[PDB]
């Protein structure tokens, strides 16, 4: 009785554990995608900032 | 993370269970071996007592 | 990371060793039981002989 229980629990718990890790892995994948998207948009934001700095330099030269 | 911790712990438990089954088999084997030695000793004792 | 990667092979070997040890223990138990049964049969035969 005890041994059969031990195997039943070990199998079903192993399946639950694998599902839990897959859920964590997919969440990490979504965070990775968002991380790359943020890398590209930070690049765009830095481009906008340097353009704004150039505009400010022109304004400073104009006066 | 937490799942890794618990899964490894359950594995640890499976390994202890496997060693437990091995130890039970070895204990039963030791009992059978003691019975075999006692039976062989009685057998030789019987064979020479029969010869006498 | 490298530690867990190479030591995982060691964990696999430990599991395989425990399984093989249990298998060998069961096999030796079966052999010991068989030899004990045959010795018991011979002992009862010789006991009948001695009684006669």
Swiss-Prot record, chain A:
GO biological process: cardiac muscle contraction; muscle filament sliding; negative regulation of ATP-dependent activity; positive regulation of ATP-dependent activity; regulation of heart contraction; regulation of muscle contraction; response to calcium ion; ventricular cardiac muscle tissue morphogenesis
Keywords: Acetylation, Cardiomyopathy, Disease variant, Muscle protein, Phosphoprotein
Keyword Zinc-finger: no
Protein origin, superkingdom: Eukaryota
Compositional bias ranges of the Basic and acidic residues kind: 22-63
Tissues in which the UniProt entry reports expression: Heart. The fetal heart shows a greater expression in the atrium than in the ventricle, while the adult heart shows a greater expression in the ventricle than in the atrium. Isoform 6 predominates in normal adult heart. Isoforms 1, 7 and 8 are expressed in fetal heart. Isoform 7 is also expressed in failing adult heart.
GO cellular component, one term: striated muscle thin filament
GO molecular function: actin binding; identical protein binding; tropomyosin binding; troponin C binding; troponin I binding
Family (UniProt): Belongs to the troponin T family.
Function of the molecule: Troponin T is the tropomyosin-binding subunit of troponin, the thin filament regulatory complex which confers calcium-sensitivity to striated muscle actomyosin ATPase activity.
Connected disease: Cardiomyopathy, familial hypertrophic, 2: A hereditary heart disorder characterized by ventricular hypertrophy, which is usually asymmetric and often involves the interventricular septum. The symptoms include dyspnea, syncope, collapse, palpitations, and chest pain. They can be readily provoked by exercise. The disorder has inter- and intrafamilial variability ranging from benign to malignant forms with high risk of cardiac failure and sudden cardiac death.
Protein name as catalogued: Troponin T, cardiac muscle
Native organism taxonomy: Eukaryota, Metazoa, Chordata, Craniata, Vertebrata
Annotated gene: TNNT2
UniProtKB/Swiss-Prot annotation, chains B, C:
Localisation per UniProt entry: Cytoplasm, Cytoskeleton
Biased composition annotated in UniProt, kind: Basic and acidic residues: 12-38
Consequence when changing residue 15 to N: Impairs interaction with LMOD2 and TMOD1
Superkingdom of source: Eukaryota
Disulfide bond entries: none
Tissue specificity: Detected in primary breast cancer tissues but undetectable in normal breast tissues in Sudanese patients. Isoform 1 is expressed in adult and fetal skeletal muscle and cardiac tissues, with higher expression levels in the cardiac tissues. Isoform 10 is expressed in adult and fetal cardiac tissues, but not in skeletal muscle.
Modified residue annotations for Phosphoserine: 45
Record region (Disordered): 1-38
N-acetylmethionine found at: 1
Quaternary context: Homodimer. Heterodimer of an alpha (TPM1, TPM3 or TPM4) and a beta (TPM2) chain. Interacts with HRG (via the HRR domain); the interaction contributes to the antiangiogenic properties of the histidine/proline-rich region (HRR) of HRG. Interacts (via N-terminus) with LMOD2 (via N-terminus) and TMOD1 (via N-terminus).
Domain comment quoted from the record: The molecule is in a coiled coil structure that is formed by 2 polypeptide chains. The sequence exhibits a prominent seven-residues periodicity.
Sequence similarity: Belongs to the tropomyosin family.
Associated pathology: Cardiomyopathy, familial hypertrophic, 3: A hereditary heart disorder characterized by ventricular hypertrophy, which is usually asymmetric and often involves the interventricular septum. The symptoms include dyspnea, syncope, collapse, palpitations, and chest pain. They can be readily provoked by exercise. The disorder has inter- and intrafamilial variability ranging from benign to malignant forms with high risk of cardiac failure and sudden cardiac death. Cardiomyopathy, dilated, 1Y: A disorder characterized by ventricular dilation and impaired systolic function, resulting in congestive heart failure and arrhythmia. Patients are at risk of premature death.
Protein name in UniProt: Tropomyosin alpha-1 chain
Organism name: Homo sapiens
């Amino acid at each position: 009785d005890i041994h059969r229980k031990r195997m039943e629990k070990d199998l079903n718990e192993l399946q639950a554990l694998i599902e839990a890790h897959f859920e964590n892995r997919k969440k990490e994948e979504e965070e990775l995608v968002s991380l790359k998207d943020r890398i590209e948009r930070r690049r765009a934001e830095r481009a906008e900032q340097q353009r704004i700095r150039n505009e400010r330099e022109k304004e400073r030269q104009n006066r | 993370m937490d799942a890794i911790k618990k899964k490894m712990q359950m594995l640890k438990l499976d390994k202890e269970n496997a060693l437990d089954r091995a130890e039970q088999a070895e204990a039963d084997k030791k009992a059978a071996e003691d019975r075999s030695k006692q039976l062989e000793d009685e057998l030789v004792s019987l064979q020479k007592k029969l010869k006498g």
